[PDB]
Design a protein around this ligand. Structure first.
Ligand SMILES: CCCCCCCCCCCCCCCCCC(=O)OC[C@H](COP(=O)([O-])OCC(O)COP(=O)([O-])OC[C@@H](COC(=O)CCCCCCCCCCCCCCCCC)OC(=O)CCCCCCCCCCCCCCCCC)OC(=O)CCCCCCCCCCCCCCCCC
Ligand SMILES: CCCCCCCCCCCCCCCCCC(=O)OC[C@H](COP(=O)([O-])OCC[N+](C)(C)C)OC(=O)CCCCCCCCCCCCCCCCC
Ligand SMILES: CCCCCCCCCCCCCCCCCC(=O)OC[C@H](COP(=O)([O-])OCC[N+](C)(C)C)OC(=O)CCCCCCCCCCCCCCCCC
Ligand SMILES: CCCCCCCCCCCCCCCCCC(=O)OC[C@H](COP(=O)(O)OCCN)OC(=O)CCCCCCCCCCCCCCCCC
Ligand SMILES: CCCCCCCCCCCCCCCCCC(=O)OC[C@H](COP(=O)(O)OCCN)OC(=O)CCCCCCCCCCCCCCCCC
Lengths: 318, 114, 175, 86, 95, 80, 347, 69, 71, 115
């Protein structure tokens, strides 16, 4: 019964990754004024299976790793984190209801970078090293800021439960009480994934994803997996945190529907932002975070420490 | 060094209140309203002298009060209370903001009659 | 239905350091620690330390070990990254701490202890929580007391940190 | 003192003997120190939360914060030492 | 040279987290509380020189709350007879 | 002053607005009328069972029967 | 460096030690040590030469790990019947680990390995602030926790400090090293008496602080890292040198000079109790340190025999190098033995 | 133009399946009604009390007012 | 109500422990009848080790480790 | 235990999928191995490295700012007590102190990133 629950959670996020990649290719296609894949199956529904079994079957391809340990560690870690992140996300019901919750997601999201340190470490290519160190740097710098945001927007919940969030949302979406901090936290969600503008790239550039996206073949179908699945997550955790629907018990699938729709549309907006804008150069990015985001986050935060005591509504910890 | 003494097993085995937390919650709200002549007294008892096994007799007392409370709600207003605790027992932290209609309904049977 | 899992996690936790502390390179140092620390989440959590466990699961795991592995990865570059050496005394102390650890989990009949360190006491049973308190973590409320009662304490901490900044950069030569 | 205490102490002393008896790599020293520090975090947590002594629960937090702003200092001195030679 | 300012200026600094009996955030008794109450009641006005001597009995009581060496050893002594009487049947009362 | 603030708000609006949210966040909790309400609320939620005391030989107040009004009344929260 | 930041650091060192003295809670005292380290790493290294970097590291490792061992002992106190206060430790073992810990914090026999090295690495002023100020905190803790001290340890660590640390320094022509080993010897005394009558420990503490104070201040007057530098200053200007030597004999405890006073009172309150043999076993080694220091007093004479005294080095311009309070502490460490009925003012 | 919307629909089924899954599995495996939420020790205590007074060992059947009769 | 019920339950349980102990431990090396171990005789809460033991070990799982990891 | 089963599964499927992904390519129909791989000469990608203080300092400030962040993390529990004055005072004080660290480092030569 319980392993049934686990399987029903984790298999559909993988299928969700495949057909997500489909929707990505299409939305970018028409956004670019051209039809996406039609010629694999009808309408493009066989495209993932192509990508899937082929991209699995192309042979391992290079080089001496120098560490047999890490090379087969990092993918397992990246997946395992990407799969367990989905546990607390509320849904009508969490599948594990944790008192703390959201800071558990915050915590594992903080662990997610060892796959980049180790992945980029075992290349034996001294350039992919440097690239990896840098990607760790930007991911980590946006692990600073984001944490403070959750530590603010949550302060209108009154507890970490991640369930009571759906209780706060009943009257008004949390986007209204703070829009700006929600804006900064959206862009923050673009950060770690390194969607455009924040992505690094091919041609001439730091090429972190040059060997990172190149190397490890099938295990690149893994890093591929954890990256897209992690995307769908951060979209969902946005949908839960900064907005949400009314939960009518006796009919949970109603809230499940509405939740699903808004989340999917949000991810759609990721893929079309990536279409939309150019990339920042690296330093302008890092100290764009240090220049402006983090100070204004501090301001809004202290204003949310002082605010609820002003208006005399401070939230009811259960 | 000192040997403890505990009451005879038959000093225990007084009465029973067997109900779910759900019913016991709202029914608890009402008897906590009208009862509590004995049990607050009980609380200054085991609170003041504190030695559970010293005051347990008055535990028999409070158990008596609650027992006859549920008895009166049995023979008096039965159905509306039943639908009420069964709608509060859909649970998810048993919220009192959930099923109101039968809160007012229940206090309506009670007040209208008892 | 073992329910020794606090003690199993304690044992693996020890094993991490035991077999860990040797060999020349830190590159596996990070691995050894992060294993032992996550097991530390195991222990602390299995006593119901939920928040604290999550903080050693955030600060120390993420912040500490990520910054370590970041510097190590930056300072040292490993072409070979071999199995190296020095692990001999680590495994031999896994045997001496295997029959010593099995000596403290063996002699555990009645009370077990050592003649070097302080006393211990032992035996198979474990003591825990009861006496429920309604709607209390018994912990997080404690930290609410950090902000209420921890006036002097948060003062000295924070100050020691900001000094942390000026010291660190001062040593990295801003001039 | 139960068992877990015995075991965590043995971890502590493994880290300490590993500190004193290996000078080869400095990062390894600093590390072993830090792992020991973790073990102290675990001790104070298990104890305090065993006795349900709540007001003192900070000792894990505030004991852990100086596990870092001191450690960070450690690594900075490590870099400034390495750039002397190598 | 340990100085006492915080009694001089009349300010509490560390006196709140000092011992288990202090006022808790929302008062929850510590496990061994009452025995703290008696150990400090015994050793309060005295000098820890003869508090060692005369408060020994009640102090050891407190220790036997905290660590639970002796009672744990007692339960152990119960399973140690239980064990060898699995051979010679004492059966079981429980269900 | 006026020119200085106009220029720092011409160049770096994020930083000016940040100091504004900061400062206003500092002062406003002192002035606003609603402050005391929050405190009285927060004190009105018991986490811990109210424990009776010996009644006879005392000054009458906070009376036995929970309906007897002599005790404190949060009714001001009942309608607010 | 900035001339503010040094004030905003030294202020934090003073603050940290003040906290180690003031707080009645363990976790605080542990924090006070942490702040004295964190803020004392910048004071050393002030000039960026690598010597101060490696030396400052050797300070940082052993000092920090000492702090951690202290925390371990505190926690074992929590295990055994326990609360967080400052008072007699309830564990004999916790007292053991804590005497070892405070034996690393300040230089002692098994743990003294770092002091000479770090003292020669770092510059003068850091040398002053290392061998005096940071030495106030641990004694301020031991004075508190003495009732549970196992006598055999601290007595041992004291003697072995005097024997080893004192016996050292012989071949050393460096100064900073000499000041280090002498620090370890005065340590052996201050900690020797600690269990009997701590008043004397604070006494030798204070006198000692004055001693190393004038010593290092004179080394700032005439900037000298070696004895050769001392002689060359003797042929530059005499007075500063004879102040250095006379203060060195006061550092040897020679009867008319004020350094003899802590030795002498320590011998009273040491020998009115039962054991007379151990004080003599200290006084022997004290003579050893003496005629070493008086080797450093045949470093000088007049109608000298050839020291190769060179030239250029007569100068027409006096030096403006600011010496903060030299004279008061010079006369105060020479002339003080005709005082001390004043001893009891201290406690 | 419509090419993407079937794929989006499939994403909708694919993210929408675990919600109905876990919800219906509560409403089945856990009895007629939701699983309790134990976050605070008090609520757990009430759970195991229901457990003991069920005679089924399960907090699913709640007994009822007439169980005292 | 929950308080009175609880304390009756625990006293019942501890006395059952007392009688079982009395049956098993009859022999020469007498510790005599079930006793406190403290030097002062007055009520002190059970250890939860004393209460649950010899209990078949099934409900010590859910009671001792039960609350953590939820239901 | 339940979430621990979820961790056992989620670690399996990771392991299983990895294993499949290693088998099938070297379980493939024909695997052929020839080409030399030159680790060899230093300038292929980049050359050597003179690791620069900037990135490391970013790790550092990530530490100090973490510490202040987690020290700030329990606040949502503490925002409700019977002392509000002190609460506001030392929460605004604390994160204000964070912003003081940042403001200092932003005043000195630190960051600025073109060097
Ligand atoms: C509405 C908002 C209200 C509000 O904000 O209230 C203030 C708010 C807290 O008040 P609250 O929340 O309203 O009430 C809290 C309660 O009182 C409850 O809190 P409390 O009762 O714990 O109060 C704590 C408070 C009060 O603390 C105390 O009362 C503790 C006192 C401990 C003893 C200190 C003795 C110092 C004696 C020094 C003498 C010389 C030393 C050296 C001698 C030998 C020299 C060789 O702590 C402080 O104020 C911080 C400590 C300040 C110490 C200052 C002296 C440090 C040593 C300096 C030595 C000299 C060095 C010079 C340089 C040398 C260079 C060569 O914040 C503060 O009080 C200050 C916080 C920030 C401190 C910054 C310090 C550094 C400043 C820049 C330098
Ligand atoms: C107990 C008190 C212990 C005092 C220890 C020393 C404190 C001063 C630290 C100076 C730091 C420094 O860098 O100084 C360098 C400077 C000179 O070095 P500098 O000039 O190269 O560098 C200083 C740089 N600035 C100016 C930016 C700070 O000053 C000195 O060297 C003067 C030292 C004077 C020491 C006086 C000791 C008095 C002891 C009195 C004891 C009385 C006990 C009574 C008990 C009853
Ligand atoms: C920048 C992001 C802001 C986000 C919102 C927060 C708003 C407030 C931010 C702080 C104000 C920044 C002003 C610019 C100049 C800052 C210079 C600075 O802090 O230098 C360190 C200053 C140095 O001051 P100083 O006297 O040496 O002079 C400045 C010298 N420089 C700039 C070279 C360093 O140190 C201190 O202020 C001492 C420690 C203060 C401890 C905390 C006190 C908090 C208030 C208690 C009441
Ligand atoms: C060489 C490497 C080998 C290892 C490789 C590992 C790969 C994967 C690493 C990443 C995964 C880390 C997972 C960590 C899980 C942490 C769980 C947690 O903290 O849960 C919080 C929750 C709090 O419960 P709460 O809501 O308060 O209460 C419930 C009702 N009362 O808590 C609970 O409900 C209680 C749960 C207790 C269950 C035991 C937890 C044991 C954790 C062991 C971790 C081992 C791995 C360490 C990490 C290694 C990282 C490289
Ligand atoms: C046994 C007791 C012995 C006596 C101890 C008391 C010492 C008192 C301080 C003596 C100060 C002497 C002094 O001021 O000398 C002057 C000189 C600078 O000259 P000035 O007149 O200040 O003008 C500047 C122009 N050049 O001064 C200087 O250059 C240095 C100035 C020093 C300033 C600090 C003075 C501190 C005074 C309080 C000390 C209290 C000590 C009490 C405990 C003693 C324990 C032994």
């Amino acid at each position: 019964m319980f392993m049934i629950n686990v399987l029903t959670l984790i298999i559909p996020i993988l299928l969700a990754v495949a057909f997500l990649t489909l929707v990505e290719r299409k939305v970018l296609g028409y956004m670019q004024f051209r039809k996406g894949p039609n010629v694999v199956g009808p309408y493009g529904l066989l495209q993932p299976i192509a990508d899937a079994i082929k991209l699995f079957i192309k042979e391992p391809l290079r080089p001496a790793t120098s560490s047999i340990s890490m090379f087969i560690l990092a993918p397992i870690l990246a997946l395992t984190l990407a799969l367990t992140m989905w546990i607390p996300l509320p849904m009508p019901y969490p599948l594990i209801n944790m008192n703390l919750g959201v800071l558990f997601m915050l915590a594992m999201s903080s662990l997610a970078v060892y796959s980049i340190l180790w992945s980029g470490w075992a290349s034996n290519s001294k350039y992919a090293l440097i690239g990896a160190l840098r990607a760790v740097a930007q991911t980590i710098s946006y692990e600073v800021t984001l944490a403070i945001i959750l530590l603010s927007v949550l302060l209108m919940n009154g507890s970490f439960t991640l369930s009571t969030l759906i209780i706060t949302q009943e009257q008004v979406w949390l986007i209204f009480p703070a829009w700006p901090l929600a804006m900064m936290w959206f862009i923050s969600t673009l950060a770690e994934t390194n969607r455009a503008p924040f992505d690094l790239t091919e041609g001439e550039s730091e090429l972190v994803s040059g060997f990172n996206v190149e190397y490890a073949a099938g295990p690149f179908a893994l890093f591929f997996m954890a990256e897209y699945a992690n995307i769908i997550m951060m979209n969902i955790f946005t949908t839960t945190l900064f907005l949400g629907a009314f939960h009518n018990p006796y009919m949970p699938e109603l809230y499940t529907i509405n939740f699903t729709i808004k989340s999917l549309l949000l991810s759609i907006t990721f893929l079309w932002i990536r279409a939309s804008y150019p990339r920042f150069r690296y330093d302008q990015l890092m100290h764009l975070l240090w220049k402006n985001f983090l100070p204004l986050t501090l301001a809004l935060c202290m204003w949310h420490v002082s605010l609820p005591i002003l208006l005399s509504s401070i939230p009811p910890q259960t | 060094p000192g040997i403890v003494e505990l009451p005879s097993l038959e000093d225990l085995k007084v009465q029973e209140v067997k109900v779910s937390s759900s019913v016991l919650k709202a029914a608890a709200h009402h008897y906590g309203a009208q009862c509590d002549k004995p049990n607050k007294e009980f609380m200054l008892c085991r609170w003041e002298e504190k030695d559970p096994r010293r005051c347990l007799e008055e535990g028999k007392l409070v158990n008596q009060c609650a027992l006859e409370f549920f008895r009166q709600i049995k023979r008096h207003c039965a159905e509306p209370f039943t639908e009420y605790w069964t709608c509060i027992d859909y649970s998810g932290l048993q919220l009192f903001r959930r099923c109101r209609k039968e809160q007012a309904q229940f206090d309506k049977c009670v007040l209208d009659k008892l | 239905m073992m329910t020794y899992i606090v003690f199993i996690l304690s044992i693996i936790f020890v094993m991490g350091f035991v077999g860990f502390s040797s060999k020349p390179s830190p590159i596996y140092g990070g691995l050894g620690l992060i294993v032992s620390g996550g097991v530390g989440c195991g222990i602390v959590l299995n006593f119901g330390g939920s928040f604290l466990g999550l903080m050693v699961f955030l600060i120390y795991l993420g912040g500490m070990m990520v910054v370590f592995g970041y510097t190590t990865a930056m300072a040292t570059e490993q072409y070979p990254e071999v199995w190296v050496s020095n692990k001999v005394v680590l495994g031999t102390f896994i045997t001496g701490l295997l029959m010593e650890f099995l000596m403290v989990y063996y002699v555990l009949k009645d009370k077990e202890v050592e003649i070097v360190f302080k006393f211990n006491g032992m035996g198979d049973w474990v003591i825990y929580d009861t006496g429920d308190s309604g709607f209390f973590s018994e912990e997080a409320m404690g930290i609410a007391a950090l902000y209420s009662y921890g006036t002097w304490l948060v003062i000295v901490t924070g100050w020691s940190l900001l000094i942390g900044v000026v010291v660190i950069m001062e040593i990295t030569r801003g001039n | 003192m139960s068992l877990v205490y015995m075991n965590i102490m043995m971890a502590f002393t493994v880290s300490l003997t590993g500190l004193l008896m290996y000078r080869s790599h400095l990062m390894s020293s600093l590390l072993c120190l830090e792992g020991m520090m973790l073990s102290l975090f675990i001790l104070a947590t298990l104890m305090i939360l065993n006795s349900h002594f709540t007001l003192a629960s900070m000792m894990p937090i505030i004991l852990l914060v100086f596990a870092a702003c001191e450690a960070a200092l450690g690594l900075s001195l490590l870099v400034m030492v390495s750039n002397t030679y190598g | 040279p340990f100085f006492d300012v915080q009694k001089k200026l009349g300010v509490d600094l560390d006196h709140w987290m000092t011992i288990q009996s202090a006022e808790q955030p929302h008062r929850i008794p510590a496990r061994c509380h009452a025995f703290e109450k008696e150990w400090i009641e015994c050793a309060h006005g005295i000098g820890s020189i003869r508090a060692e001597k005369e408060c020994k009995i009640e102090f050891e009581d407190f220790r036997e709350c905290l660590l639970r060496q002796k009672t744990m050893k007692r339960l152990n002594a119960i399973k140690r007879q239980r064990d060898k009487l699995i051979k010679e049947g004492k059966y079981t009362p429980p269900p | 002053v006026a020119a200085f603030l106009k220029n720092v708000w011409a160049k770096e609006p994020v930083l000016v607005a940040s100091f504004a949210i900061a400062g206003l966040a500092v002062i406003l909790p002192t002035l606003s009328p609603y402050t005391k309400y929050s405190l009285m609320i927060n004190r009105a939620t018991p986490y811990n069972y109210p424990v009776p005391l010996r009644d006879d030989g005392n000054m009458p107040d906070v009376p036995s029967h929970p309906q007897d009004p002599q005790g404190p009344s949060l009714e001001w929260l009942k309608r607010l | 460096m900035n001339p503010i930041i040094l004030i905003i650091i030294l202020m934090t060192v003073m603050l940290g030690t003040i906290i180690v003295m003031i707080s009645t809670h363990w976790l605080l005292i542990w924090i006070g040590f942490e702040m004295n380290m964190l803020a004392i790493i910048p004071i050393m290294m002030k000039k960026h030469n690598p010597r101060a970097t490696e030396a400052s590291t050797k300070y940082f490792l052993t000092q920090s790990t000492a702090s951690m061992l202290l925390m371990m002992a505190i926690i074992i106190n929590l295990m055994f019947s326990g609360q967080w206060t400052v008072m007699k430790l309830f564990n004999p073992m916790a007292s053991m680990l804590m005497t070892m810990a405070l034996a690393m914090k300040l230089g002692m026999a098994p743990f003294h390995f770092w002091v000479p090295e770090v003292t020669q690495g770092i510059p003068l002023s850091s040398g002053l602030i290392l061998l005096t100020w940071q030495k106030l905190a641990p004694m301020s803790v031991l004075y508190q926790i003495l009732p549970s001290i196992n006598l055999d340890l601290i007595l041992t660590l004291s003697i072995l400090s005097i024997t080893i640390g004192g016996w050292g320094g012989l071949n050393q022509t460096q100064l900073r090293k000499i000041m280090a080993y002498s620090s370890i010897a005065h340590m052996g005394w201050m900690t020797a008496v600690l269990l009997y009558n701590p008043t004397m420990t604070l006494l030798n503490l204070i006198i000692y602080i004055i001693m190393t104070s004038t010593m290092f201040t004179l080394f700032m007057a005439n900037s000298t890292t070696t004895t050769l530098s001392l002689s060359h200053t003797w042929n530059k200007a005499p007075i500063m040198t004879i102040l250095v030597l006379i203060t060195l004999l006061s550092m040897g405890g020679l009867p008319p000079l004020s350094g003899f006073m802590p030795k002498w009172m320590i011998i009273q309150e040491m020998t009115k109790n039962d054991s007379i043999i151990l004080p003599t076993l200290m006084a022997i080694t004290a003579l050893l340190n003496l005629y070493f220091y008086m080797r450093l007093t045949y470093s000088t004479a007049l109608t000298m025999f050839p020291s190769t005294n060179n030239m250029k080095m007569k100068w027409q311009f006096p030096t403006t190098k600011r010496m903060t309070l030299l004279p008061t502490m010079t006369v105060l460490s020479t002339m003080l033995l005709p005082l001390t009925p004043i001893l009891s003012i201290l406690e | 133009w419509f090419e993407v919307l079937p794929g989006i629909a499939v994403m909708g089924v694919c993210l929408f399946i675990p919600g109905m899954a876990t919800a219906r599995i509560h409403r089945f495996s856990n009895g007629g009604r939701e699983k309790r939420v134990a976050h605070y020790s008090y609520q757990w205590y009430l759970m195991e009390r229901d457990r003991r007074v069920s005679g089924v060992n399960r907090y699913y059947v709640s007994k009822g007012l007439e169980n005292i009769d | 109500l929950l308080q009175a019920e609880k304390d009756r339950r625990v006293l019942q349980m501890l006395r059952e422990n007392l009688e079982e102990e009395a049956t098993i431990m009859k022999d020469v090396p007498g510790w005599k009848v079930g006793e406190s171990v403290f030097h002062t005789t007055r009520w002190v809460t059970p250890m939860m080790g004393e209460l649950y033991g010899l209990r078949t070990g099934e409900e010590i799982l859910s009671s001792t480790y039960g609350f953590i990891w939820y239901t | 235990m339940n979430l621990m089963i979820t961790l056992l599964t989620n670690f399996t499927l990771a392991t299983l999928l990895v294993t499949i992904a290693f088998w099938l390519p070297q379980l493939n129909v024909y695997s052929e191995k020839t080409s030399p791989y030159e680790c060899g000469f230093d300038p292929m990608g980049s050359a050597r490295l003179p690791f620069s203080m900037k990135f490391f300092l970013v790790a550092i400030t990530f530490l100090l700012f973490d510490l202040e962040i987690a020290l700030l993390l329990p606040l949502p529990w503490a925002s409700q007590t019977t002392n509000l004055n002190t609460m506001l005072t030392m929460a605004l004080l604390l994160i204000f102190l964070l912003a003081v660290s940042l403001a200092y480092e932003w005043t000195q030569k630190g960051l600025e990133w073109t060097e």
